[PDB]
Write a protein that holds these residues in place. Structure first.
Motif: not given
Lengths: 674, 669
Positions: A435-436, A439-440, A443, A463, B436, B440, B463, B465
């Motif tokens: 779900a993210c 956005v990872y 980026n 990840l 978000c 994580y 690892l 964002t």
DNA sequence: GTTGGTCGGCAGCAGGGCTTTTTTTTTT
DNA sequence: GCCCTGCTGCCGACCAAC
């Protein structure tokens, strides 16, 4: 001979062609609604002789397009199906298919969105800048984004959205607008309203294509232009009406309609377009539509009354030589409104009592709420029946999942619609992390593409799916099922989509009292494959002329996935067994038998439509359009004691039931309810 | 049939079986209450039936509503969902104008509740700073605006026309505050509001709703009046009552025998509303009540005699019988209030525990903060004082502090609480936690748990964002180090608490009605409370539990976790409960032991309300409700010469003590 | 030369610390 | 039992006008 001037009211005879100038024509009641349009196409064929293939008219309904096409192939005839006339959204997909990607930016393998998926996408993108699940509801976001899209703020609006000063109530959606456009471009798909915004922006920013794609078609014809928002007003100023300034005589640009059928105006339609059309090309004459085909003296008088005195509008004396009599049923009294049903009893009992052949009935709704549910649970007694306009296909969760699975077959990258729900048959997907990881990777730069195929093989982000790359295995199998495909045959859910077959076996295995759900799923499979069987080729394509770049080859349901024009089915043997249709969808159909709720303000003006807003006249006008309707036996009814939907509410006495006169048309006489 | 007809002599359930509006009962404490209510509705079940809401019922607040709903679910076979019979008029009007549409803009839903009556307090503070004078006190003067709205008297017009004395500030703030809140009304937490008001006007408005209201659900049942007034009387007379104006059939209005409690006499409730049905609907003859189970035969008969003092003329022929009986205890230890009462209750409680379980041992107090350290009594019967904290579980006020010690001075074991820090109004939007990214981030670490990723600046989960690492690392460093270094006394506004109050004041400067404004006063009174604890925990004239400041503040925090836990799991087995009983909660708790004190004068009254014979009368009935609030056994004890801080207020005699013929109430000393 | 006025400030001494509830028009 | 503030009575200094 007579074909050129087929029998009609001499009013349209003096309306005639008058080719050689922009033309405006008025409307009111039936007035041969879109039948004058058929006589217009007959004019263009025969009275003036412009040609056959040089026609592109604009409408507001696919059903209207179908009925005018069948009328043309009947009266006009000469097949005339190689060329076609299509409705507003269909003209949108037409100018995005024949003119799909002969332009920078968007690509030809595009897509289209819907209402629910638009709400979901906007809610998801707003979650990135979360403003509560209830403060700014997705329906509110959708209506706001539409009513800011209706004005022509092209998708470079870093100045337009930020032009606001102070103010309240969420201009932050304007800030979200650029990211919204970015996300939809990631799937190369558009929305309802922007589907004309991109076109008009291209026609205004790209001049080379202008006065160049006109070499295909030079003719245009408009109906219900009175019902028009600012976006499509600018469209007709530039796209379909085409010539604004400069100066090139097109093929008989022409409009018809009047402000009195001003339905569909609350969430964007600037009704003034007909009023201020002198701002547009002034060289046209106001027409005087006065007669009718299927009205009656009493009902036409009622319509003229409910159009005359609310506030300032332009209208004329409207009447017809048709037969009179059979006064309106003003029988309003005590003995309960709809709590103890008793209305459908009136309809059906009068049906067998009189010469009604189960072929004619009309009652209109008032709200999208449980009015339909109660209306059903009170008409279940009436065995002759057919429910219509109840929203029954292409909105349910499971069927939307399968539609998406058809859609994921192509276009790698389909926004939230790509996943719909990844954990659809309770796969076990750990919806988190991925779900993210979007956005990872964004980026890094990629929105929802390689990150998806970033899996057991795609350890570029690596990840930490959860801890075990089992979800990497699941998404590996997901891209595996995405890869496998076959032709437009018995594979759409079944053969090469065996994973959806196992979805089917799972749902059939569990099915708690979902047996009717099973059979409706089977019916949808059947219709999906018959669209791959009845449409296919030959019957659909044939030797037809004109050039289409890519539609048809697995673009089968890419077109008609929307069909968003409120399609309706009309049998003949059971044409009027039960035709409960909400008035908004109703546009003056052919049911003389009427039992509409209609009036008694407090519910006719909705819970929001209190006091005196700037749209009560619109409510009176929609009531007028509802009573336009059809021929005699408009056996309307009402009571005096109102209570519905659980907790009761009281209902004042309408001015619309009072603006119609007391003596010259029948009103309350005695105590019985009907 | 009569499968629900329990064992009961005819008198009480006559109001259940005998149909007709002119039916009344005389009932004190220990009556059927909801038992007779459910029996009447079940008799109607054998009769006409539900009809969704054929007969309504007015009641008390949720404390009665929940148990009423439970009895309805249980006593009658039908499951639930008859209709809204929620907290009296406060919910009746709210559910009424939901569909009624005359003047409402956003469905009213107003309460002038604790936050909103504090809004009233702040606006009158502004008026005080701007109109005339202090006008007595900032508190206990809202009675004027209350009974102004309570009896629906004119806003200010004839009040000013009355030409009264130097109290025109009330008329000014009545002209204001009638339209000052009219632009919008929101939030619902209290009972009174203007909800009980301005709804008769709706009933005095368009008569269509009034006509239909008793056409579809006919009539209502009326319980113990108590929280009513003559305006509420005309409401119940017309809200569901028909007044025999246009309604063809009469009203089935039976009346419950409202005893004399006046629990909110401060908030306003007259007496003629219950004793003078003669100048009302037909005379409504009453019936006697006999059975009771609150106290033993000796205690019950003596209470019947005590309530028969009849200082204020009250219809009382009721007698209540029971089984065994015993005499009252005579333990007085010459003041020494703290030590004497603690040792008396302790020895008696231990002797009881050698024979009977601690599951409902408690005590009654007189709205004051005193007595020995609460640790011993709380560990006597397990669960802490689950009495009242003003339902303090609201905003960050109870949780940011209660995790401040999780983050520093001990382990942050409550990782869910840590996520709640990550759910701070800062960490939500201000120092946003990046859901978000956070979800994580704490998900990272395979062997994840706690704020370990937030710990060590997240070197292992790098690892995560990348561009976010700036702001994520900054907020992480703040939340970790800034709190970790906190080792000082840490009160008022310091460490980070000064920042918390700072941005609460920031939202306070804006629009919202006390939102982020009242909680400033709440944190001020919370630090006042922790200072008070320091009066008996840290600087306890010699530290009680302050073995260096860390354990003292942590003991305060465990007391706070006890207070916020209140009623929870670990069911009531063995050492069950200890609670401090207040008058305003004196309903619902059986309280099978009564070690109450203060039955003498000096505090009943305490020089506020000395002579006032009528006021002395409702204080006498206050004593009646206190003595009748008991179960099983009771042995009340007292002390003499209450030497409190310098004001003794000697009370050697009371009009309650020695007017009894000593058949039960005798000290044997 | 001198007592009454006026404030300025502080130690005693006593009144006073009580309050129950959240939902729906453009609809295509 | 214990604290906040109002009320009460009590040292102590500067001005004046008689």
């Amino acid at each position: 001979a007579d074909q050129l001037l087929d029998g009609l009211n001499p009013q349209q005879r003096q309306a005639v062609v008058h080719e050689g100038s922009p033309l405006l024509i008025v409307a009111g009641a039936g007035s041969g609604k879109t039948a004058v349009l058929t006589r217009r196409i007959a004019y263009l064929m025969a009275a003036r002789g412009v040609g056959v293939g040089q026609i592109l008219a604009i409408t507001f309904t696919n059903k209207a397009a179908a009925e005018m096409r069948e009328r043309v192939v009947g009266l006009v005839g000469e097949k005339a199906r190689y060329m076609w006339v299509s409705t507003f959204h269909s003209t949108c997909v037409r100018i995005l298919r024949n003119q799909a990607a002969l332009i920078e930016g968007l690509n030809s393998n595009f897509s289209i969105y819907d209402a629910d998926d638009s709400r979901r996408l906007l809610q998801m993108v707003g979650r990135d800048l979360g403003l509560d699940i209830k403060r700014y509801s997705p329906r509110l976001l959708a209506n706001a984004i539409s009513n800011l899209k209706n004005e022509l703020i092209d998708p470079h609006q870093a100045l337009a959205g930020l032009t606001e000063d102070s103010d309240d109530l969420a201009r932050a959606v304007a800030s979200v607008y650029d990211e919204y456009q970015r996300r939809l471009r990631a799937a190369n798909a558009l929305d309802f309203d922007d589907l004309i915004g991109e076109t008009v922006a291209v026609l205004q920013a790209f001049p080379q294509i202008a006065q160049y794609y006109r070499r295909r078609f030079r003719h245009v014809l408009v109906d219900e232009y009175q019902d028009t928002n600012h976006a499509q007003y600018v469209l007709v100023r530039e796209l379909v009406g085409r010539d604004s300034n400069d100066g090139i005589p097109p093929g008989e640009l022409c409009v018809v309609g009047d402000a009195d059928q001003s339905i569909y105006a609350f969430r964007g339609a600037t009704i003034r377009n007909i009023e201020d059309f002198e701002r547009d090309y002034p060289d046209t004459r106001t027409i005087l539509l006065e007669q009718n085909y299927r009205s009656t003296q009493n009902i036409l008088s009622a319509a003229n009354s409910v159009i005359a005195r609310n506030a300032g509008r332009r209208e004329k004396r409207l009447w017809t030589d048709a037969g009179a009599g059979e006064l309106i049923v003003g029988y309003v009294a005590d003995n309960e409104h709809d709590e103890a049903r008793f209305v459908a009893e009136e309809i059906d009992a009068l049906a067998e009592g009189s010469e009604i052949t189960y072929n004619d009935v009309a009652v209109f709704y008032r709200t999208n709420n449980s009015s339909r549910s109660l209306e059903e649970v009170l008409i279940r007694a009436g065995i002759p029946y057919k429910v219509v306009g109840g929203v029954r296909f292409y909105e349910r969760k499971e069927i939307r999942d399968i539609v998406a699975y058809l859609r994921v077959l192509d276009n790698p990258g389909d926004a939230v619609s790509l996943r719909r729900i990844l954990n659809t048959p309770r796969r076990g997907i750990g919806d988190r992390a991925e779900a993210c990881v979007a956005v990872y990777a964004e980026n890094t730069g990629v929105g929802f593409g390689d990150a998806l195929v970033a899996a057991a093989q795609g350890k570029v982000p690596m990840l930490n799916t959860r801890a075990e790359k089992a979800i990497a295995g699941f998404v590996e199998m997901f891209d595996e099922l995405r890869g496998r495909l076959d032709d437009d045959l018995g594979e759409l859910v079944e053969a090469v989509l065996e994973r959806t077959g196992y979805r089917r076996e799972l749902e059939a295995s569990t099915d708690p009292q979902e047996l009717a759900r099973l059979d409706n799923l089977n019916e949808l499979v059947s219709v999906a494959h018959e669209f791959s069987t009845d449409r296919e080729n030959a019957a659909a394509l044939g030797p037809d002329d004109e050039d289409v770049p890519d539609t048809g080859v697995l673009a089968d349901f890419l077109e008609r996935v929307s069909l968003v024009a409120d399609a309706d089915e009309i049998p003949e043997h059971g044409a009027g067994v039960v035709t409960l249709m909400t008035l908004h969808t109703a546009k003056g159909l052919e049911f003389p038998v009427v039992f509409v709720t209609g009036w008694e303000d407090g519910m006719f003006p909705h819970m929001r439509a209190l006091d005196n807003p700037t749209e009560l006249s619109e409510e009176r006008r929609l009531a007028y359009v509802g009573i336009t309707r059809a021929r005699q036996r408009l056996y309307v009814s009402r009571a005096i004691v109102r209570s519905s939907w659980g907790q009761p509410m009281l209902n004042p006495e309408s001015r619309f039931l009072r603006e119609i006169p007391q003596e010259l048309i029948d009103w309350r006489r005695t105590a019985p309810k009907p």
